[PDB]
C-alpha cells in the first residue's frame, strides 16, 4: 500500500523498444483488456512527454480460450536495479527438482494489488498499435506492479510469505518456489491428493484477494521422471566400414568430454580402402578398446559444477520426425543437463511450433533446477523465428536467444 | 462570451543535466529590425508571446527572411540549440498508413485547423527557455525580450504535442461516430465516410461544433484541396490509389548520384507496378560512393532499365482493402536472387505489389529465398492489414514436404497452395541417408602449404582407381573441395564419398544450389547429374584407412 523506491542501474536510460506488428485479433483483445485495466486503475494513459516503450502482445495460456496480455519486459528487466535489499536472494530450493509432481500456478494477478513507485511508472510505458497505423497507438503506463517485470515478485515477496504462512505450517513437506509470475508447488503425494492440496492452495489466494482470471489453471510437471542422456555406443554383430567410421567419429567427439577415450585400435580397422558397405571383423585389440571406451562412458563427466555467476546456455538440434535433442551448459563439453523430446503436441507439420514448445519446456526445466532461464542457440533463421514464435507462446516469461546459421556436425552424435 | 475548454499542457523538461540555450543574437539591419518588431507586436496581442524582463538568462537567435518576390519579411526563430537540449518525445507519425490498407470512401472532407495550432499552450515552466531578443536600432537601447506562450514552429516538441493534443480533443467524437474516419496531417483534418452526402456534411458540421468547444475555428469557405489527394508520394482517390507519376529520364551517361535516385524511383514504383527489377542497377553502386563518378552501364543494367521502362509505359492503379474478404499473395521468381509478388482479394485487382531481393551471402538456394520472401510479405501484411494472406507459390507441395522434413533447421511457411507458373522452385539434388550398396567408394583428401600456397587434391577408391592433381595458389579449404569435385567428376551415377573436411560438409549440409565460389558451383553441377550420392565424414589424422592412404599422397 506504500511504494518501494525503485531505480534503474547507474548510467542507464529507460527502454525504448519498438512494438512489433500485431494481428487484428490480438489488437482487439488488448484493447478490451486494457480498457478494463484502466477502469480498475491498474494502468493510465500517458502523454508524448514519455518516450519509453516496451512491446506487448497477447497469448492464450495452455488449455484455455481467454486472451492474456503479455508485456515483453526483457529490456526493462536488464536495466532495472538488482533487488538484494531485504534478501541477497531467494536461495534456489534444490529439493524442488525431486518432487514426484510440481504444479505451476499463474499468480501474477496478485501483483496488481500493490501500487508501483510513482517515479518508476514512466518506464513501464507500452503502446497498443492500430492496423496500418491509421490511428495513433494507445499509450499506457502501469500504476501497479506489472506482470513479467522482475521487480514484481521481489517487491511482492513479503506479502507472498505472509499469505502462504498457514499453508506452509500445515503442509510442511511441500516445496514452494516463486519465479516471476509463476508459483511452483512440489509434493510427493498421489495425483489426486496433490490436485486437492493445489486447490487448497488456490483457496488462500482467493481468500486473501477478497477475481484472478488464470489462477484456476494448473500445469502438472513430474521432475522425478525427467530422463537424461548418457553417451551410448551401438552393439552390433557385423560392423561395416561405414559403421566403424561413424563409431570412431562419435568416439573422437566423446574424447573432448571424457579424458581416456581411445580410437587408435579401431582406426586401425579401417586400414585399406574398402567399400563402405563391406563388413569388417573386429580384432581382439579393437574389441578391447571398444569395451574400455564403453566402461569410461558409464561414469559421470569430471569437474562439472554449476556456477551461479555465469549464464546458462541451451543448444537444440532438430533430429527429425518430431524429435529434438538439447544440452544445457556453461562451459563447452561440461553439460549440466541433456535431454530429448518427441511429444510435440499438435505440431506434426509445423517445425516452428515444435521448436517454440521445446524452448518453453527447456526453460521450465531450467527454472526448476537453477532458478533462472538459459540463453538459447536456436537452429532457425532469425526472420522465420521472429515472425512466428509469438503465435505459439504460452509462458508468461521470455528467455533470450540467438540463431545458429551453420549446421552442427554434432547433431549426428546426440541422435 | 462562450467559455472554451482549456487544453491541458504537457510537462516538458530539458535532457538530464542540461541547461537552456544562451546563444548570441546576430546583428540585423535597421530594415530587418523594423519588420520583426511589427510581426512580434501582433503576435504579442494574439497571446502567442510575451515581453520579459532582464533576469531571464536564456536566448535563441531570430532572423528576418525575405519571402521571395515580395516586400514582406517573415520571422525565423532558430531553435536548433534548444532542440539539442530538449528531452525526447513519443513520435506517433513514424509509421505512415499504406494506401493499400485504407478502405474505400464515398466522401472525404478536409478541414483547416491551422489556427488551432497555437491555441496549444506551452508548459509554463518551460517557456523561459524559449527567450529571444529583437536587437534595438543602432544598439542604443536594450533589445526587446520575448518568450513563447505556445508551441513554437521549429521547436522539437511541437509536432508530437500538437498531434497528441488534437488526438485527445477528437477522441470522443471518433468514439461516438464509428461510421467516420479522421486523420490529421500537417494543419488539416481529413474526415472520410460512406455516408450519404447529406449525412456526411451533417457529421462535418457536428465536428465543427465539437471543435468549437475548444475555441478552434474552421474556415467556412471549404478547403481548396479535394479528392484526389497528393499525399506522401501517392495519389489517393475515393476508390483507387496509385503512386505519383514515375518518369525515368533519358540519359547518355549516368553518374553515381543519378543511379541512386533511379533506384529510388524504381523502389517507389515497385509497390504497384508488378515485376520492377533493380539488382543490376544496384550492382553499379557496389562499394564506391564518389557521388559524381560516371559508371558505364553493363549490357545487363541496360537490359534491366529497358524492361523497367516497358513496365512503366502506362499508369496502373491499386484498389483499397475489403475486410470481408481474404488476402491472397502470389510470388514469382525473377532470377539473380530477385522475387516479385502481388497481393489481391479478387483476381486481377491488386491491392499492392512488391519485390524481395537475395541477401548477400556465400551460398544460397531458391527454397530458402522463397521462404524469406514469404516471411517478409507475412510481416508487411500484418502491419498493413492485421492478418496473414494465403500464399500462391511456385513450388510443388511434395517438394516443400521433402525440403522441410530433411532440412537441418526448423522452418515453416503459412497456409499456401501450389501455383503452376514457371519457373518452378525445385530441389536439384538430395544426398542419401545410407551408404549405397554396389556403388564405388571414393576416399578423398587435399592439403596445401600455407607459405607457398602449393597443394594437392585427390582420391583413392575400393576398386583401385586413384587420382592426385597438383594445384597452385590454393588453400587447405580449396583443396578439400577440389578433391570432392574430382571424385564427383570421375565416378558413375551412384557414388559413396568419404571426406574429413568439416568445411566441405558444412557447405554441402546447407544444400546450396548456387554459390559465390565457382568451385562450389562446379560441385553443385556435378551433384545434379548424379542419381545417388552418399557423403561420409571421418575425423582427420586418425589412421582411418582409405583416408590415411590419400592423406599421405596429397600432403607429400
Ligand atoms: C490515412 C488517411 C489519409 C488521408 C488523406 C491524406 C492526404 N492528403 C485521409 C484519410 C481519411 C486517411 N485515413 C483513412 C482511414 C481509413 N480509410 C481511409 N480511406 C481513404 C482515404 C482517402 C481517400 C481518398 N481520396 C479514400 C479512402 N482513410
Ligand atoms: N492519374 C489520375 C487517376 C485517376 C483516377 C484514378 C487514379 Br488511381 C488515377
Ligand atoms: Mg588432410
From Swiss-Prot, chain A:
Effect caused by changing residue 149 to F: 10% loss of DNA-directed DNA polymerase activity. 22% loss of RNA-directed DNA polymerase activity
Residue ranges of domain Reverse transcriptase in the record: 40-221
Motif Tryptophan repeat motif per record, residues: 385-401
Effect annotated for changing residue 152 to G: Complete loss of polymerase activity. No loss of RNase H activity
UniProt-reported outcome of changing residue 218 to A: Complete loss of RNA-dependent DNA polymerase activity. Complete loss of RNA 5'-end and 3'-end cleavages
Effect of substituting residue 163 to T: 34% increase of DNA-directed DNA polymerase activity. 18% increase of RNA-directed DNA polymerase activity
Effect in UniProt of substituting residue 213 to A: No effect on RNA-dependent DNA polymerase activity. Complete loss of RNA 5'-end cleavage. No effect on RNA 3'-end cleavage
Stated consequence of mutating residue 392 to L: No effect on RT p66/p51 heterodimerization
Organism from which the protein derives: Human immunodeficiency virus type 1 group M subtype B (isolate BH10)
Name of the featured protein: p51 RT
Record note on what altering residue 163 to L does: 80% loss of DNA-directed DNA polymerase activity. 23% loss of RNA-directed DNA polymerase activity
Mutation effect (residue 180 to L): 90% loss of polymerase activity. No loss of RNase H activity
Annotated phenotype, changing residue 152 to T: Complete loss of polymerase activity. No loss of RNase H activity
Outcome of swapping residue 152 to A: 74% loss of polymerase activity. 56% loss of RNase H activity
Effect in UniProt of substituting residue 215 to A: No effect on RNA-dependent DNA polymerase activity. No effect on RNA 5'-end and 3'-end cleavages
Effect of residue 181 to A: Strongly decreased RNA-directed and DNA-directed DNA polymerase activities. No effect on RNase H activity
Effect the entry attributes to changing residue 182 to N: Loss of pyrophosphorolysis (reverse of the polymerase reaction). No effect on RNase H activity
Effect of residue 393 to L: Decreased RT p66/p51 heterodimerization
Gene expressing this chain: gag-pol
Amino acid at each position: 500500500i506504500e511504494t518501494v523506491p525503485v531505480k534503474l542501474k547507474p548510467g542507464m536510460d529507460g527502454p525504448k523498444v519498438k512494438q512489433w506488428p500485431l494481428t487484428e485479433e490480438k489488437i482487439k483483445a488488448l484493447v478490451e483488456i486494457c480498457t478494463e485495466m484502466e477502469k480498475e486503475g491498474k494502468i493510465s494513459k500517458i502523454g508524448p512527454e514519455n518516450p519509453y516503450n516496451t512491446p506487448v502482445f497477447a497469448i492464450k495460456k495452455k488449455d484455455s480460450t481467454k486472451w492474456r496480455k503479455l508485456v515483453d519486459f526483457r529490456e526493462l528487466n536488464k536495466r532495472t536495479q538488482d533487488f538484494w535489499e531485504v534478501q541477497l536472494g531467494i536461495p534456489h530450493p534444490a529439493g524442488l527438482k525431486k518432487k514426484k509432481s510440481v504444479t505451476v500456478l499463474d499468480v501474477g494477478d496478485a501483483y496488481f494489488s500493490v501500487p508501483l513507485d510513482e517515479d518508476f511508472r514512466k518506464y513501464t510505458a507500452f503502446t497498443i498499435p492500430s492496423i496500418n497505423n491509421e490511428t495513433p497507438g494507445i499509450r499506457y503506463q502501469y500504476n501497479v506492479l506489472p506482470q513479467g517485470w522482475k521487480g514484481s515478485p521481489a517487491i511482492f515477496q513479503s506479502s507472498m510469505t505472509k499469505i502462504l504462512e498457514p499453508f506452509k505450517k500445515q503442509n510442511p513437506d511441500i516445496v514452494i518456489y516463486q519465479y516471476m509470475d509463476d508459483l511452483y508447488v512440489g509434493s510427493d503425494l498421489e495425483i489426486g491428493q496433490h490436485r486437492t492440496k493445489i486447490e487448497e492452495l488456490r483457496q488462500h489466494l482467493l481468500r486473501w484477494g477478497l477475481e484472478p482470471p488464470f489462477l484456476w489453471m494448473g500445469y502438472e510437471l513430474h521432475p522425478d521422471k525427467w530422463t537424461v542422456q548418457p553417451i551410448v555406443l551401438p552393439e552390433k554383430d557385423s560392423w561395416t566400414v561405414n559403421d566403424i567410421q561413424k563409431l570412431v567419429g562419435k568416439l573422437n567427439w566423446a574424447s573432448q568430454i571424457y579424458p581416456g577415450i581411445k580410437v587408435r585400435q579401431l582406426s586401425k580397422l579401417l586400414r585399406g580402402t574398402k567399400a563402405l558397405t563391406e563388413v569388417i571383423p573386429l580384432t581382439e585389440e579393437a574389441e578391447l578398446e571398444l569395451a574400455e571406451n564403453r566402461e569410461i562412458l558409464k561414469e559421470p563427466v569430471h569437474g562439472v559444477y554449476y556456477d551461479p555467476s555465469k549464464d546458462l546456455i541451451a543448444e537444440i538440434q532438430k533430429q527429425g520426425q518430431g524429435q529434438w535433442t538439447y544440452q544445457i551448459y556453461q562451459e563447452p563439453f561440461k553439460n549440466l543437463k541433456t535431454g530429448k523430446y518427441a511429444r510435440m503436441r499438435g505440431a506434426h507439420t509445423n517445425d516452428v511450433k515444435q521448436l517454440t514448445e521445446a524452448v518453453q519446456k527447456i526453460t521450465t526445466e531450467s527454472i526448476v533446477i537453477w532458478g533462472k532461464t538459459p540463453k538459447f542457440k536456436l537452429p532457425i533463421q532469425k526472420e522465420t523465428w521472429e515472425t512466428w514464435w509469438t503465435e505459439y507462446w504460452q509462458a508468461t516469461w521470455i528467455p533470450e536467444w540467438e540463431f545458429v546459421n551453420t549446421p552442427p556436425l554434432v547433431k549426428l552424435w546426440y541422435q | 462570451m462562450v467559455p472554451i475548454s482549456p487544453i491541458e499542457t504537457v510537462p516538458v523538461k530539458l535532457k538530464p543535466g542540461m541547461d537552456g540555450p544562451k546563444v548570441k543574437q546576430w546583428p540585423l539591419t535597421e530594415e530587418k529590425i523594423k519588420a520583426l518588431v511589427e510581426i512580434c507586436t501582433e503576435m504579442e496581442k494574439e497571446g502567442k508571446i510575451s515581453k520579459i524582463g532582464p533576469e531571464n538568462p536564456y536566448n535563441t537567435p531570430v532572423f528576418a527572411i525575405k519571402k521571395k518576390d515580395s516586400t514582406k519579411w517573415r520571422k525565423l526563430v532558430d531553435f536548433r540549440e534548444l532542440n539539442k537540449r530538449t528531452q525526447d518525445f513519443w513520435e506517433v507519425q513514424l509509421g505512415i498508413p499504406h494506401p493499400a490498407g485504407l478502405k474505400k470512401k464515398k466522401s472525404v472532407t478536409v478541414l483547416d485547423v491551422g489556427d488551432a495550432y497555437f491555441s496549444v499552450p506551452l508548459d509554463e515552466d518551460f517557456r523561459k527557455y524559449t527567450a529571444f531578443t529583437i536587437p534595438s536600432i543602432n544598439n542604443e537601447t536594450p533589445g526587446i525580450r520575448y518568450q513563447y506562450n505556445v508551441l513554437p514552429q521549429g521547436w522539437k516538441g511541437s509536432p508530437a504535442i500538437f498531434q497528441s493534443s488534437m488526438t485527445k480533443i477528437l477522441e470522443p467524437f471518433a468514439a461516438q461516430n464509428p461510421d467516420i474516419v479522421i486523420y490529421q496531417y500537417m494543419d488539416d483534418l481529413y474526415v472520410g465516410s460512406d455516408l450519404e452526402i447529406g449525412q456526411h456534411r451533417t457529421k462535418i458540421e457536428e465536428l465543427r461544433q465539437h471543435l468549437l468547444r475548444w475555441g478552434l475555428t474552421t474556415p467556412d469557405k471549404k478547403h481548396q484541396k479535394e479528392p484526389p489527394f497528393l499525399w506522401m508520394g501517392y495519389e489517393l482517390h475515393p476508390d483507387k490509389w496509385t503512386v505519383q507519376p514515375i518518369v525515368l529520364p533519358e540519359k547518355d551517361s549516368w553518374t553515381v548520384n543519378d543511379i541512386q535516385k533511379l533506384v529510388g524511383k524504381l523502389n517507389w514504383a515497385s509497390q504497384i507496378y508488378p515485376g520492377i527489377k533493380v539488382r543490376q542497377l544496384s550492382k553499379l553502386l557496389r562499394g564506391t560512393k564518389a557521388l559524381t563518378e560516371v559508371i558505364p552501364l553493363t549490357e545487363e543494367a541496360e537490359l534491366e532499365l529497358a524492361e523497367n521502362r516497358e513496365i512503366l509505359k502506362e499508369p496502373v492503379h491499386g484498389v483499397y482493402y475489403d475486410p470481408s474478404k481474404d488476402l491472397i499473395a502470389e510470388i514469382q521468381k525473377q532470377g539473380q536472387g530477385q522475387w516479385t509478388y502481388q497481393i489481391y482479394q479478387e483476381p486481377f485487382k491488386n491491392l499492392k505489389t512488391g519485390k524481395y531481393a537475395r541477401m548477400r551471402g556465400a551460398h544460397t538456394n531458391d527454397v530458402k529465398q522463397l521462404t524469406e520472401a514469404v516471411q517478409k510479405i507475412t510481416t508487411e501484411s500484418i502491419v498493413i492489414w492485421g492478418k496473414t494472406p494465403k500464399f500462391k507459390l511456385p513450388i510443388q507441395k511434395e517438394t516443400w514436404e521433402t525440403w522441410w522434413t530433411e532440412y537441418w533447421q526448423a522452418t515453416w511457411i503459412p497456409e499456401w497452395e501450389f501455383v503452376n507458373t514457371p519457373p518452378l522452385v525445385k530441389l536439384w539434388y538430395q544426398l542419401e541417408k545410407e551408404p549405397i550398396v554396389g556403388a564405388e567408394t571414393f576416399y578423398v583428401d587435399g592439403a596445401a602449404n600455407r607459405e607457398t600456397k602449393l597443394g594437392k587434391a585427390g582420391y583413392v577408391t575400393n576398386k583401385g582407381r586413384q587420382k592426385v592433381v597438383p594445384l597452385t595458389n590454393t588453400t587447405n579449404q580449396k583443396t578439400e573441395l577440389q578433391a570432392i569435385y574430382l571424385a564427383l567428376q570421375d565416378s558413375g551415377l551412384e557414388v559413396n564419398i568419404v571426406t574429413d573436411s568439416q568445411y566441405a560438409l558444412g557447405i554441402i549440409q546447407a544444400q546450396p544450389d548456387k554459390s559465390e565460389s565457382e568451385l562450389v558451383n562446379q560441385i553443385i553441377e556435378q551433384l545434379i547429374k548424379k542419381e545417388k550420392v552418399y557423403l561420409a565424414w571421418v575425423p582427420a589424422h586418425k589412421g582411418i584407412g582409405g583416408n590415411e592412404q590419400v592423406d599421405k599422397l596429397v600432403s607429400a
